[PDB]
Amino acid sequence: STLIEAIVAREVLDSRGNPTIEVDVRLESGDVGRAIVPSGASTGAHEALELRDGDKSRYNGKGVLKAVQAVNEDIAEALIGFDAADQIALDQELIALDGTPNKSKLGANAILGVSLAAAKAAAAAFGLPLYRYLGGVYAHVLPVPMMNIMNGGQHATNSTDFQEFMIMPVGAESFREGLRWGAEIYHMLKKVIHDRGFSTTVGDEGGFAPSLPTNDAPLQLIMEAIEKAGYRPGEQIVIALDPATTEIHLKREGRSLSSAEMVDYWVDLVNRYPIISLEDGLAEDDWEGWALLRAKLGDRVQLVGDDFLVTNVQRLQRAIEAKAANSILIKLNQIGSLTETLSAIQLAQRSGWTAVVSHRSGESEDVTIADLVVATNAGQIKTGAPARTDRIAKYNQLLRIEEELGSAARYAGRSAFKV
Amino acid sequence: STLIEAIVAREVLDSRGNPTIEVDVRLESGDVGRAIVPSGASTGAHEALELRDGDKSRYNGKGVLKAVQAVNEDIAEALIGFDAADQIALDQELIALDGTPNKSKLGANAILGVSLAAAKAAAAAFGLPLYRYLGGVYAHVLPVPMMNIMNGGQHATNSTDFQEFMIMPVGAESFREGLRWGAEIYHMLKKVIHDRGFSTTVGDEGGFAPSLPTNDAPLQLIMEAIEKAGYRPGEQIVIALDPATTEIFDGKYHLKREGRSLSSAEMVDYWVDLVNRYPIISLEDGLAEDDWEGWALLRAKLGDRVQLVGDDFLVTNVQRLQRAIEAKAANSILIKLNQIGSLTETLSAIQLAQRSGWTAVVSHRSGESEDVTIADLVVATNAGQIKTGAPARTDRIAKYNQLLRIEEELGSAARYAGRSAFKV
Numbered sequence: 001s002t003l004i005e006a007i008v009a010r011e012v013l014d015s016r017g018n019p020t021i022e023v024d025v026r027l028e029s030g031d032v033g034r035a036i037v038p039s040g041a042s043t044g045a046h047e048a049l050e051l052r053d054g055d056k057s058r059y060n061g062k063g064v065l066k067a068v069q070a071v072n073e074d075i076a077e078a079l080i081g082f083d084a085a086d087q088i089a090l091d092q093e094l095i096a097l098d099g100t101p102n103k104s105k106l107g108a109n110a111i112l113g114v115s116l117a118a119a120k121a122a123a124a125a126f127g128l129p130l131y132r133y134l135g136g137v138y139a140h141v142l143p144v145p146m147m148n149i150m151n152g153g154q155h156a157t158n159s160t161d162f163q164e165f166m167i168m169p170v171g172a173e174s175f176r177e178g179l180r181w182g183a184e185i186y187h188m189l190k191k192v193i194h195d196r197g198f199s200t201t202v203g204d205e206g207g208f209a210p211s212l213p214t215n216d217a218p219l220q221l222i223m224e225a226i227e228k229a230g231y232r233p234g235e236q237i238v239i240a241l242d243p244a245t246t247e248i249h250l251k252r253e254g255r256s257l258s259s260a261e262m263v264d265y266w267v268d269l270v271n272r273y274p275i276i277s278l279e280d281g282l283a284e285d286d287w288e289g290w291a292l293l294r295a296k297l298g299d300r301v302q303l304v305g306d307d308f309l310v311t312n313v314q315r316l317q318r319a320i321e322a323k324a325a326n327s328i329l330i331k332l333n334q335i336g337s338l339t340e341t342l343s344a345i346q347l348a349q350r351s352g353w354t355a356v357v358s359h360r361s362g363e364s365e366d367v368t369i370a371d372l373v374v375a376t377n378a379g380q381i382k383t384g385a386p387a388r389t390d391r392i393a394k395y396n397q398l399l400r401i402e403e404e405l406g407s408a409a410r411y412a413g414r415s416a417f418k419v
Numbered sequence: 420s421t422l423i424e425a426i427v428a429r430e431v432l433d434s435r436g437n438p439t440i441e442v443d444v445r446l447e448s449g450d451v452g453r454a455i456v457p458s459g460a461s462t463g464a465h466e467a468l469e470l471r472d473g474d475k476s477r478y479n480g481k482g483v484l485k486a487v488q489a490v491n492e493d494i495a496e497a498l499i500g501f502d503a504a505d506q507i508a509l510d511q512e513l514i515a516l517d518g519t520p521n522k523s524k525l526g527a528n529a530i531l532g533v534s535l536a537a538a539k540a541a542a543a544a545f546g547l548p549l550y551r552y553l554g555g556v557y558a559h560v561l562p563v564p565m566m567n568i569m570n571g572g573q574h575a576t577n578s579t580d581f582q583e584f585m586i587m588p589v590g591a592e593s594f595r596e597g598l599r600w601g602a603e604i605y606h607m608l609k610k611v612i613h614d615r616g617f618s619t620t621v622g623d624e625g626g627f628a629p630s631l632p633t634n635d636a637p638l639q640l641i642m643e644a645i646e647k648a649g650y651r652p653g654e655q656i657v658i659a660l661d662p663a664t665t666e667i668f669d670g671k672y673h674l675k676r677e678g679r680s681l682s683s684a685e686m687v688d689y690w691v692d693l694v695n696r697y698p699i700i701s702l703e704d705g706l707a708e709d710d711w712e713g714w715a716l717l718r719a720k721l722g723d724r725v726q727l728v729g730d731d732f733l734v735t736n737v738q739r740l741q742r743a744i745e746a747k748a749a750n751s752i753l754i755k756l757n758q759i760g761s762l763t764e765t766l767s768a769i770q771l772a773q774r775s776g777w778t779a780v781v782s783h784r785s786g787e788s789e790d791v792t793i794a795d796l797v798v799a800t801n802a803g804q805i806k807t808g809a810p811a812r813t814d815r816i817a818k819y820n821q822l823l824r825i826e827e828e829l830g831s832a833a834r835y836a837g838r839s840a841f842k843v
């Protein structure tokens with residue numbers, strides 16, 4: 001009944017127009033689970049690896065026909081007859097079939113698609129919504145969203161060294177209210193940024209990327225857009241940053257350097273502005289800097305390891321022991337399977353850290369991360385600006401989940417933060 | 420078993436981040452149909468009217484709680500127990516329950532939401548895909564897409580006048596190939612534009628909106644992008660345009676970056692000349708909203724070799740369409756599901772144009788969603804053409820993805836419209 005009958009994959013397009021894999025897993029019950037796999041950066045590196053074609057006569061080598069073939073043949077022959085209700089066993093069967101430590105044989109994209117589609121197929125067989133099937137009876141916490149509003153850096157026309165500037169509606173009584181708050185402030189930002197010498201176009205996440213005079217100015221625009229929309233900073237709306245320092249050395253504020261100096265810069269911002277979170281505040285492998293950044297403001301700021309931890313258990317366990325950070329950014333496709341993602345979410349959580357579930361550049365109509373964040377009571381999500389279906393779909397799923405929980409639903413609010 | 424047991428609505432967000440209505444229709448079988456309504460007015464008019472809250476303390480008055488209540492209360496009470504498999508009768512029930520000729524009491528958005536969700540609930544009950552449930556056994560034609568790749572006029576800081584420039588992969592053997600062709604060209608145009616000093620922007624469709632100097636420049640940049648991508652203009656790729664001349668119309672039209680005006684007859688001559696210079700197969704709103712005299716003349720001069728699509732001119736209005744059919748005003752109509760307000764009436768407008776030799780072009784709206792109904796509607800009615808924008812934002816791409824799934828599912832039965840979509 002929950003035993004796999006057929007596993008089918010196809011090549012579809014992501015939110016950038018780039019090819020991506022969609023996997024359909026059909027059970028004996030006749031229930032089908034469908035999943036679209038994201039894609040972003042960077043690699044090859046040492047995150048799980050996606051199987052791309054390299055055929056220059058199709059989509060400039062970005063085709064995923066080999067990953068589709070690894071599902072329709074290799075994964076399908078090996079998993080037909082497997083019980084889809086047994087997620088942990090299915091994922092270790094996928095990892096076993098691949099044999100490589102970074103999913104390079106079958107592809108991280110082929111493995112994750114099956115991994116996620118099998119969970120959805122089974123959830124529909126038990127007639128359960130995904131968050132409930134994944135996290136059990138206690139899955140009820142709606143996350144405070146990290147809503148992108150302003151960009152910066154490479155796209156691009158030139159902006160402050162910084163990369164992403166996000167808002168967080170902590171003070172809201174529900175996700176529905178918090179969503180309205182950020183959407184209002186996103187539109188109110190344009191009633192300040194527009195008619196001043198800028199466009200209304202968007203990027204890959206829906207946010208904007210204008211030109212700025214100083215590094216202190218984007219914060220001043222956001223803080224104005226908050227009270228202009230009628231919201232109180234700190235108490236209701238709080239700032240979350242992703243400077244993504246790995247790509248850069250402030251070029252140019254006049255001060256470029258130094259691992260110890262950089263930590264001192266962030267301490268000033270938090271003292272005058274309501275910053276609750278800082279993501280990739282130091283480089284990919286600058287382990288010495290992270291430890292200092294933690295000891296300085298870790299008890300008043302959230303420090304998120306994105307490129308620093310790359311959704312890896314080995315370096316997450318290393319940063320837990322070293323006390324290098326207090327938050328990890330969870331990218332489903334960076335690890336390659338559901339079980340391994342759930343494993344990394346729990347490890348961070350049970351070490352007093354927070355798991356921030358995130359989307360990527362190449363998104364889809366797929367809303368798994370909205371059900372994964374409620375299933376694990378993660379308390380936070382990073383799924384982009386309130387402006388593109390690749391991002392809005394996730395916010396809509398959170399609205400459906402909140403409504404479906406009824407009186408059981410609880411919005412994380414300030415309780416999402418471990419200060 | 421296909422009898423409606425529950426009808427519930429909620430306020431979700433569209434691709435612009437504005438509130439929109441989502442309707443769920445649950446049948447006695449336990450099957451649920453879900454539909455999101457795309458947006459959407461509230462360019463009076465002669466169309467169906469959507470219900471917005473006007474409460475400025477929520478989403479700047481753009482809330483949709485009133486339309487949600489008209490569903491959760493008025494429509495649910497009236498339609499619980501109605502057979503969802505009877506589409507026409509259901510839509511007649513929604514139209515009668517409203518009582519207004521423009522769906523202003525309940526809201527066009529509440530009516531469309533239920534009309535669409537009931538069809539999906541029913542398709543799931545018969546265990547059929549939507550296109551099959553809607554158009555029957557002969558629903559198999561995959562459309563040639565009108566892919567938005569360049570933007571101008573309004574969304575133009577100051578350069579350019581017209582509004583949108585699209586490419587159509589007429590020469591492809593399948594929708595899968597045609598979508599790749601357009602994707603490759605759009606990306607090649609992203610290279611061409613950056614290798615000129617501009618950036619890679621994307622208004623709500625996904626198309627690039629640069630500040631250009633001449634009216635020909637967007638068409639030239641497109642010809643270069645088609646060629647550098649490795650495709651042949653005319654034979655493989657054709658240009659479809661929506662200048663939306665209502666936006667630049669005392670008068671006789673006004674071309675800001677060309678320093679001209681002239682007569683509707685001269686504005687026709689402008690299109691006659693441009694069509695001789697570029698592989699333009701289709702032109703949408705070549706003349707303004709109510710220039711019925713101009714439209715009739717534009718048909719006489721180009722209607723034998725160019726598709727003339729009425730959008731703001733016909734506004735998915737069956738009375739205006741019947742007038743234009745007789746008056747010989749156009750030869751194609753842009754079909755907006757939410758401008759008419761119901762599925763039955765959309766099917767009626769598509770059929771009226773189809774019989775009588777016109778083409779029905781199914782279109783998306785500026786504020787779209789994850790909802791992919793128009794992909795199933797274009798196949799169900801074998802329309803042959805779709806207008807779903809650039810191959811970029813998921814609001815657009817979701818529809819392309821649904822068409823890929825439809826083409827795969829049909830297998831040997833699937834047929835891409837190709838050049839047969841046209842009357843050139």
Ligand SMILES: O=C(O)[C@@H](CO)OP(=O)(O)O
Pocket residue numbers: 039040041042205306358359360361362382
């Ligand atoms: O940092 C992130 O969360 C994402 C942005 O969507 O980056 P990328 O997808 O490029 O890894």
Ligand SMILES: O=C(O)[C@@H](CO)OP(=O)(O)O
Pocket residue numbers: 458459782783784785786806
């Ligand atoms: O015509 C269209 O395709 C869209 C995009 O501009 O406009 P509207 O909002 O009128 O649907």
Ligand SMILES: [Mg+2]
Pocket residue numbers: 242244279280306307
């Ligand atoms: Mg990051």
Ligand SMILES: [Mg+2]
Pocket residue numbers: 661663703704730731
């Ligand atoms: Mg138009």
